[PDB]
Amino acid sequence: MTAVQLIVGLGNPGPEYDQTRHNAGALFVERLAHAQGVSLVADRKYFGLVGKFSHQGKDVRLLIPTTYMNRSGQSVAALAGFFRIAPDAILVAHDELDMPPGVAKLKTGGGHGGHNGLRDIIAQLGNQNSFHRLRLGIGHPGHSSLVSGYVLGRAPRSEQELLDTSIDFALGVLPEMLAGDWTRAMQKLHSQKA
Numbered sequence: 404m405t406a407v408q409l410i411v412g413l414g415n416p417g418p419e420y421d422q423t424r425h426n427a428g429a430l431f432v433e434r435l436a437h438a439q440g441v442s443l444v445a446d447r448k449y450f451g452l453v454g455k456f457s458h459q460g461k462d463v464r465l466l467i468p469t470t471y472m473n474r475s476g477q478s479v480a481a482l483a484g485f486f487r488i489a490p491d492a493i494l495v496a497h498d499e500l501d502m503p504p505g506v507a508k509l510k511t512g513g514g515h516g517g518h519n520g521l522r523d524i525i526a527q528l529g530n531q532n533s534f535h536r537l538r539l540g541i542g543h544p545g546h547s548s549l550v551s552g553y554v555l556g557r558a559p560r561s562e563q564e565l566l567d568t569s570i571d572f573a574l575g576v577l578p579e580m581l582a583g584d585w586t587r588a589m590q591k592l593h594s595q596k597a
Contacts (some may be wrong), residue, residue: 476527
């Protein structure tokens with residue numbers, strides 16, 4: 404119904420954070436960009452890395468903010484505002500504590516669940532939460548006190564691999580996501596198993 408015009412992948416910038424769990428969304432957008440032969444260009448105007456490709460006669464943009472995670476909204480709002488992109492045409496990929504490694508799910512709207520990247524995006528988009536999310540499971544450490552260290556850590560190999568698998572599964576439903584056929588994307592995706 405509403406074609407996706409912007410896919411955002413959340414993560415923290417720079418070497419200490421690279422390959423950390425909290426960068427799951429960025430990894431997805433990096434994988435996507437490589438698979439589609441899209442270059443991600445560093446563009447200070449959008450506070451991130453930005454790429455573009457054409458699908459069905461429309462430009463689709465890829466964005467990896469290079470703000471810190473808590474200021475990701477600044478990047479999304481810059482780019483979506485400049486191109487007059489409505490929240491309903493945005494997909495945000497992010498790490499999801501509430502699903503284990505190997506599981507990816509889609510969701511439309513709702514809250515941030517304490518994800519401070521999502522929280523900033525909702526805030527910056529003028530309290531619009533009606534964007535779509537690709538939730539990439541990273542597991543939960545099992546107490547709230549452990550969550551900061553966990554998301555900012557490098558998962559062991561087994562969990563990294565399972566994340567990669569769930570990213571492949573989500574790439575499998577790219578055609579649906581781009582078209583905005585969230586119902587079909589969800590049936591296909593939510594039916595997979597790592």
